[PDB]
Amino acid sequence: GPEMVRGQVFDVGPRYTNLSYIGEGAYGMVCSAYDNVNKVRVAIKKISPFEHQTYCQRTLREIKILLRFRHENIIGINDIIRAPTIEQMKDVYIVQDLMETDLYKLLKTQHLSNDHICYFLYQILRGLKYIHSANVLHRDLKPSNLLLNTTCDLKICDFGLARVADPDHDHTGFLTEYVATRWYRAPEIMLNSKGYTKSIDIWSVGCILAEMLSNRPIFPGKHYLDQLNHILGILGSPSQEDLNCIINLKARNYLLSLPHKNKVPWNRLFPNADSKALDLLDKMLTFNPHKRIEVEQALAHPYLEQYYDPSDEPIAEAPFKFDMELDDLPKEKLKELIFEETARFQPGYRS
Numbered sequence: 103g104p105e106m107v108r109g110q111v112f113d114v115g116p117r118y119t120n121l122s123y124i125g126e127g128a129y130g131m132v133c134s135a136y137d138n139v140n141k142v143r144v145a146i147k148k149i150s151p152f153e154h155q156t157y158c159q160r161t162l163r164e165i166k167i168l169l170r171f172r173h174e175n176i177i178g179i180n181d182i183i184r185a186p187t188i189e190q191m192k193d194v195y196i197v198q199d200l201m202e203t204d205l206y207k208l209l210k211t212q213h214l215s216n217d218h219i220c221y222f223l224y225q226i227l228r229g230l231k232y233i234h235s236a237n238v239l240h241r242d243l244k245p246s247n248l249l250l251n252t253t254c255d256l257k258i259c260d261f262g263l264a265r266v267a268d269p270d271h272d273h274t275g276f277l278t279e280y281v282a283t284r285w286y287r288a289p290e291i292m293l294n295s296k297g298y299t300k301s302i303d304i305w306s307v308g309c310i311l312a313e314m315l316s317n318r319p320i321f322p323g324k325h326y327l328d329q330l331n332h333i334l335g336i337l338g339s340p341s342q343e344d345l346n347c348i349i350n351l352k353a354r355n356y357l358l359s360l361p362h363k364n365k366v367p368w369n370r371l372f373p374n375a376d377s378k379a380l381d382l383l384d385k386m387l388t389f390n391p392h393k394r395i396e397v398e399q400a401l402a403h404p405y406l407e408q409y410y411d412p413s414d415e416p417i418a419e420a421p422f423k424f425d426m427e428l429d430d431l432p433k434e435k436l437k438e439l440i441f442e443e444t445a446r447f448q449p450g451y452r453s
């Protein structure tokens with residue numbers, strides 16, 4: 103029904119009231135509201151994607167995945183409010199639990215103790231273990247996608263770029279997909295356009311760990327070649343065999359033309375960090391995806407030994423499946439599927 107706030111309209115309510123602007127997401131404003139059903143404050147994502155096909159893909163993907171996932175380190179969807187008629191629907195409001203902050207903003211104001219870092223990492227990898235067990239790739243793990251309520255309450259969010267894992271799905275379309283925010287993008291994405299393996303999420307987590315240890319991003323490239331420059335500057339010039347799985351024969355070039363850099367020792371870059379953290383970091387930031395540590399091995403690393411508990415780390419009941427590949431569907435078809443997926447939150451949804 104009613105409502106406004108900062109000039110924009112928020113067709114939330116009567117249920118949701120006492121609004122209060124929060125900030126900006128992708129294609130939408132984001133306030134907090136009071137849920138008059140649940141008698142607590144919640145976050146409401148106002149999304150306007152239907153203009154561009156790509157924005158509708160991401161919006162669709164996030165709904166399908168979050169509605170199927172259930173895990174305490176992964177944000178849920180509590181309520182989806184949209185218009186009654188498909189033609190009259192031009193906004194979508196996604197209602198989710200209200201979180202105090204996210205890792206990105208927290209790292210702007212605080213240096214994290216080893217302890218706190220340790221249990222943040224544990225909660226990231228516990229959530230990641232459920233995601234990968236569902237055969238799903240997040241593909242955009244980074245601090246602003248880690249929502250935080252306390253040192254003991256971390257939730258992964260924003261599954262807009264997620265995919266079902268397809269260790270074979272190749273396409274080598276370097277301009278055809280947006281895979282990971284640049285600073286957190288694994289080398290095999292940039293060198294082989296190989297963005298459908300679980301290794302890419304582990305890389306990102308490694309970038310997030312490095313960032314927790316120093317309050318700055320470890321690889322802040324301006325563009326993708328500068329990104330590779332920052333990686334080789336700490337990892338050192340690659341081997342022949344790491345240069346073996348560089349499928350793009352032209353991608354070779356800017357690397358071969360490089361001045362042999364030495365591997366910077368982790369403890370030199372992070373003199374104050376726990377050596378156990380620095381050893382796990384080493385396993386996560388391996389250039390070659392095939393030697394990089396997997397999520398269950400990361401959880402079992404000695405650095406997480408205080409918390410690792412396979413009996414309290416849920417996995418998915420069944421692999422997740424996109425019943426249709428929506429890579430190339432017109433944005434009017436996607437808007438249809440969105441209208442459908444959000445049907446369960448409308449009066450009279452049968453079945």
Ligand SMILES: COc1cc2nc(NC(=O)c3csc(COc4ccc(F)cc4)n3)sc2cc1OC
Nearest residue numbers: 208212213214215216218315316372373374375376
């Ligand atoms: C979310 O708000 C809070 C923030 C917060 N930050 C804290 N940091 C320290 O106490 C603290 C004590 S030694 C230290 C330095 O660590 C390292 C480790 C490795 C490295 F390579 C560089 C540095 N850091 S404790 C804390 C509690 C908060 O809420 C209860």
Ligand SMILES: Nc1ncnc2c1c(I)cn2[C@@H]1O[C@H](CO)[C@@H](O)[C@H]1O
Nearest residue numbers: 125126127132145199200201203204
């Ligand atoms: N559930 C939530 N609780 C708090 N903040 C959230 C969310 C969601 I989902 C997204 N955001 C966005 O991330 C930032 C939080 O610091 C904010 O800028 C906001 O854009």
